[PDB]
XYZ file of C-alpha atoms in Angstrom:
94
model
C -99.062 -101.902 144.526
C -102.100 -103.525 145.106
C -105.962 -103.819 143.955
C -106.782 -101.678 146.776
C -105.457 -98.946 145.118
C -107.618 -96.806 142.626
C -106.885 -99.539 139.548
C -110.484 -101.067 139.768
C -111.576 -98.047 141.838
C -111.354 -95.130 139.606
C -112.767 -92.065 140.801
C -113.335 -90.883 136.952
C -116.206 -93.975 136.856
C -117.816 -92.141 139.093
C -117.557 -88.843 137.412
C -118.865 -90.049 134.230
C -121.776 -91.848 136.610
C -122.943 -88.459 137.927
C -122.303 -87.104 134.753
C -124.103 -89.006 132.724
C -126.527 -89.778 134.800
C -128.484 -85.911 135.916
C -131.019 -84.937 132.946
C -131.303 -87.831 130.378
C -132.813 -91.394 130.723
C -133.839 -93.674 133.661
C -130.318 -95.338 134.363
C -128.843 -97.315 137.181
C -125.038 -97.532 137.009
C -123.012 -100.348 138.308
C -119.472 -101.494 138.237
C -116.871 -104.518 137.489
C -113.427 -103.399 136.917
C -113.406 -100.262 135.485
C -116.439 -101.225 133.176
C -119.721 -99.376 132.906
C -122.902 -101.677 133.519
C -125.957 -100.227 133.105
C -129.691 -100.751 133.184
C -131.562 -98.256 131.562
C -135.024 -96.624 130.438
C -136.226 -94.133 128.070
C -138.805 -92.262 130.501
C -137.606 -89.109 129.307
C -134.027 -89.564 128.320
C -131.716 -86.356 126.619
C -134.357 -83.280 126.326
C -133.036 -80.483 128.198
C -129.663 -81.206 126.582
C -129.721 -80.001 122.987
C -126.137 -81.256 121.655
C -123.018 -82.489 123.243
C -120.522 -85.022 122.096
C -117.680 -86.322 123.902
C -116.553 -89.615 124.591
C -114.928 -92.230 127.422
C -112.164 -94.210 127.162
C -110.625 -97.583 128.590
C -106.948 -98.755 128.770
C -106.516 -95.952 127.115
C -109.072 -96.764 124.179
C -112.004 -95.712 123.486
C -115.649 -97.441 125.008
C -118.215 -94.852 124.130
C -119.112 -92.164 121.751
C -122.181 -90.137 122.078
C -124.247 -87.171 122.011
C -126.637 -86.107 124.825
C -129.688 -86.167 122.339
C -128.423 -89.596 121.363
C -129.109 -90.571 125.063
C -126.472 -92.862 126.786
C -129.645 -95.072 127.407
C -129.967 -96.769 123.752
C -126.059 -96.651 123.415
C -125.094 -98.292 126.890
C -127.289 -101.158 125.518
C -124.582 -101.528 122.743
C -121.593 -99.750 124.849
C -122.446 -103.081 126.807
C -121.393 -105.566 123.708
C -117.979 -103.592 123.590
C -116.003 -106.400 125.723
C -115.007 -103.450 128.220
C -112.150 -103.457 130.291
C -110.280 -101.529 132.938
C -106.789 -99.593 133.374
C -106.838 -96.396 132.163
C -109.969 -94.431 132.091
C -110.535 -90.928 130.322
C -113.280 -88.710 129.901
C -113.018 -85.799 127.434
C -114.564 -84.158 124.242
C -114.185 -85.183 120.995
């Protein structure tokens, strides 16, 4: 197996990217391994979405817990201190 595979290139990252970055706050995602790096602003955040909660998992562990009203902008700040890693990414509700 080679690192050219979907190891660091997890399609799930791209789904999360396009899932979170829709009708929330200003948020530019960036990738490193399977980390979710990002810059965010509070130019509106989650209004459209009332309340939905799901979680993202890395290596099979968690790395993210949020409600759409909690807005990933403020959360991502803190999430980036989780010492995020990369190998087994999941996308699901909690």
